[PDB]
Amino acid sequence: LKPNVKEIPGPKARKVIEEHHKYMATTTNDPNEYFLVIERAEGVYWIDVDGNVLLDFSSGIGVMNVGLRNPKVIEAIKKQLDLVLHAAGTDYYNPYQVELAKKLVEIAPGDIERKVFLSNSGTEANEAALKIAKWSTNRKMFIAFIGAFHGRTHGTMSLTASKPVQRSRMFPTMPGVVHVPYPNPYRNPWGIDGYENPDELINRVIDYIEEYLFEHYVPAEEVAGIFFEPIQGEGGYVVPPKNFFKELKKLADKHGILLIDDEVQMGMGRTGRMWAIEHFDIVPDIVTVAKALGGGIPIGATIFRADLDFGVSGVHSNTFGGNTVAAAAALAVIEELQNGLIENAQKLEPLFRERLEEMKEKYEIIGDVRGLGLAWGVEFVKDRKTKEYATKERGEIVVEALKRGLALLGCGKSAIRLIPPLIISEEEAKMGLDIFEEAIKVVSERHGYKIH
285 near ligand PLP, judged by CB under 6 A = no
When CB distances are held under 5 to 8 angstroms depending on the partner's kind, the choice from a second copy, ligand PLP, none that residue 414 binds is none
Restricting to residues 104-133, name those near ligand PLP by CB under 6 A: 121-123, 126
CA–CA separation, 337 and 423 (whole Å): 10
- State the minimum distance, in angstroms, from the CB of residue 232 to ligand PLP: 8
Name which of a second copy, ligand PLP, none residue 95 binds, using a CB cut-off of 5 to 8 Å depending on partner kind: a second copy
- Could you say which of a second copy, ligand PLP, none residue 240 binds, taking C-beta under 5 to 8 angstroms by partner kind? none
Nearest residue (CB) to ligand PLP, 125 versus 401: 125
CB 214 within 8 A of CB 245: no
Residue 338, annotated ligand binder? no
> Which option in ligand PLP, a second copy, none does residue 135 bind, with CB closer than 5 to 8 A by kind?
a second copy
Shorter beta-carbon distance to ligand PLP: residue 390 or 411: 411
All residues at 6 or more sequence positions from 340 whose CB lies less than 8 Å from its CB, including other chains: none
User: Binding-site residue total for ligand PLP (CB under 6 A)?
Assistant: 18
Q: How far is the CB of 415 from a second copy (least distance, A)?
A: 14
The whole-angstrom separation of Cα 422 and Cα 282 is 25
Distance CA 126, CA 262 (A): 7
Beta carbons of 359 and 115 less than 8 angstroms apart: no
In whole angstroms, what is the distance from residue 194 CA to residue 201 CA?
Answer: 6
According to CB under 6 A, which residues from 353 to 412 bind ligand PLP?
Answer: none
- Least separation, in Å, of the C-beta of 42 and a second copy? 9
Number of Cβ atoms within 10 Å of the Cβ of 445: 10
319 is in an annotated binding site: yes
SS3 (DSSP) at 48: strand
Binding residue for ligand PLP, selected from 151, 183, 185, 236, defined by CB under 6 A: 151
Q: Minimum Å distance from CB 240 to a second copy?
A: 16
Minimal distance, residue 235 CB to a second copy, in Å: 8
Contact 408, 401 (CB under 8 A): yes
Q: How far is the CB of 425 from ligand PLP (least distance, A)?
A: 26
The strand pair at 286-290 and 300-305 is best described as: antiparallel
166 is in an annotated binding site: no
Give the strand pairing for 141-145 and 406-407.
unpaired
Amino acid code (one letter) for 223: V
Query: Which segment (105-113, 129-137, 261-269, 331-339) binds ligand PLP by CB under 6 A?
Result: 261-269
CB 292 within 8 A of CB 62: yes
* Residue closest to ligand PLP when measured from CB atoms: 122
The one-letter amino acid code at 213 reads: L
Burial (CB count within 10 angstroms: exposed 0-12, middle 13-18, buried 19+), residue 239 = buried
Stretch in the footprint of ligand PLP (CB under 6 A) among 33-41, 241-249, 260-268, 347-355: 260-268
> Residue 398 is which amino acid?
V
Does 147 appear as a known binding residue? Answer: no
What x/- string results for residues 307 through 336 when contact with ligand PLP is judged by CB under 6 A? -----------xxx----------------
Q: Are 310 and 316 in contact (CB under 8 A)?
A: yes
Give yes or no for a contact between 282 and 251, defined as CB atoms under 8 angstroms apart. no
CA-atom Rg of the chain in angstroms: 22
Looking at the Cβ atoms of 145 and 352, the one nearer to a second copy is 145
**Contact pick of 229, 393, 396, 400 for ligand PLP (by CB under 6 A):** 229
Q: Which residue lies nearer to a second copy by CB, 317 or 338?
A: 317
Q: Return the half-sphere exposure (C-beta side, CA atoms, 13 A cut-off) of residue 362.
A: 12
> What is the separation of C-alpha 251 from the centre of its chain, rounded to a whole number of angstroms?
25
Q: Which residue positions form the known binding site for pyridoxal 5'-phosphate? A: 122-123, 265, 319
Q: Which residues are annotated as a binding site?
A: 122-123, 265, 319
Residues forming the site for ligand PLP (CB under 6 A): 121-123, 126, 149-151, 229, 233-234, 262, 264-265, 290-291, 318-320
